[PDB]
Amino acid sequence: EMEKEFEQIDKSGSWAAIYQDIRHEASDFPCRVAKLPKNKNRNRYRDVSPFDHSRIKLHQEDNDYINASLIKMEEAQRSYILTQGPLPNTCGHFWEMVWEQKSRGVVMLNRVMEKGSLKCAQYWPQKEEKEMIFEDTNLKLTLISEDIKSYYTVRQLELENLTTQETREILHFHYTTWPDFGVPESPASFLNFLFKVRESGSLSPEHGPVVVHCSAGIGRSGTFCLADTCLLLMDKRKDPSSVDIKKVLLEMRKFRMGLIQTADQLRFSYLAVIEGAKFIMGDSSVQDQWKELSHED
Ligand SMILES: O=C(O)COc1c(C(=O)O)sc(-c2ccccc2)c1Br
């Protein structure tokens, strides 16, 4: 039902119970590679690991492990790589993964420092003149430009495979005002930011999967991906009522643990999708409305 369901859940105020049921039903696969002693320093959180079956393997002989999951949505025909915020020792692996998986876009939904603590290494360069070289993976990364808005920033980077001397443009979409364990300001703020990613071409089938991360790579990242997938699904069918959000989330959780972290995050997903349906179904206007409502200037 979607909008009828949302308002049935609001009416009773049963969002916690709906969310817990999803947690109850969720898939549980081994994360044996992630739990190997030699990988302990490659994981940011003890209890957030990628399942062996869907994990991204680095193309080296030495240690192919990264805390990263491929979310391959078959019906939707879109994939995402959900990963944790890279650590000081895994920034090289991060860019290796981006290179090997032919990703064009990186979506970052967290701040480097949140609530006094460092949720993510400084993995991209903050100034044109001070490029980064990742010696372990032989990659160079250069800030090409940045367009700073009120609550989000878009950065052009150039990624270079130092071995082959091939270079790629990576688009970096940094949402700076999404609180950990929280939700965006409004559906408008969120949708405005999602459509920026969309409009960049980063989600094209002709590219590798977009890399999405926050700190753990499941809460805010899960929320972002659910909404995008639900919108794509109804887009393909031009049929909002054919989307079962909880069923999509459950499908998503086959590929990485714990996607969406609070009941309110789930409630926001419903919100964002219901509002986003307006554009999908032929309302040009709402895109301009979101932009205004988001106060991006
Ligand atoms: O993305 C979010 O909303 C919350 O993400 C986060 C964390 C953070 O950003 O500090 S810690 C965390 C978490 C870590 C271990 C177990 C269960 C949850 C998650 Br999940």
Of 31, 120, 214, 230, which is the active-site residue? 214
Query: Helix 15-25 vs helix 263-280: angle between axes, to the nearest 10 degrees?
Result: 90
Establish whether 18 is an annotated binding residue.
no
Distance (Å, rounded) from C-alpha 272 to C-alpha 220? 13
Tokens 């930011």 belong to 193
Q: What is the CATH number of the domain that holds 253?
A: 3.90.190.10
Q: Nominal resolution in Å? A: 2.3
- Look at strands 55-57 and 78-83 and give their pairing: unpaired
Q: Give yes or no for a contact between 261 and 26, defined as CB atoms under 8 angstroms apart.
A: no
Contacts of 49 (CB under 8 A, 6+ apart): 31, 34, 35, 43, 67, 257
Q: In one letter, which amino acid is 276? A: G
Q: Say which residues have a Cβ less than 8 Å from residue 293's Cβ, sequence separation at least 6.
A: 186, 188, 189, 192
State the method: X-ray
Residue 20 CA to residue 27 CA, distance in Å, equals: 13
Tokens 């944790």, residue?
A: 84
Is 31 considered catalytic here?
no
List the domain range (segments joined by +) for residue 280: 1-297
Q: Which residues line ligand 1 (CB under 6 A)?
A: 45, 47-48, 119, 180-181, 214-216, 218-220, 261
Distance of CA 114 from the midpoint of ligand 1 (Å): 11
CA distance 157 to 168: 8
What's the per-residue H, E or C state across 201-247? CCCCCCCCCEEEECCCCCHHHHHHHHHHHHHHHHHHHCCHHHCCHHH
Round to whole Å and give the CA distance between 221 and 223: 5
- Asked whether 145 and 156 are in contact (CB, 8 A), the reply is yes
In 3D space, the residue among 52, 73, 57, 45 whose CA is nearest the CA of residue 213 turns out to be 45
The count of domains in the chain is: 1
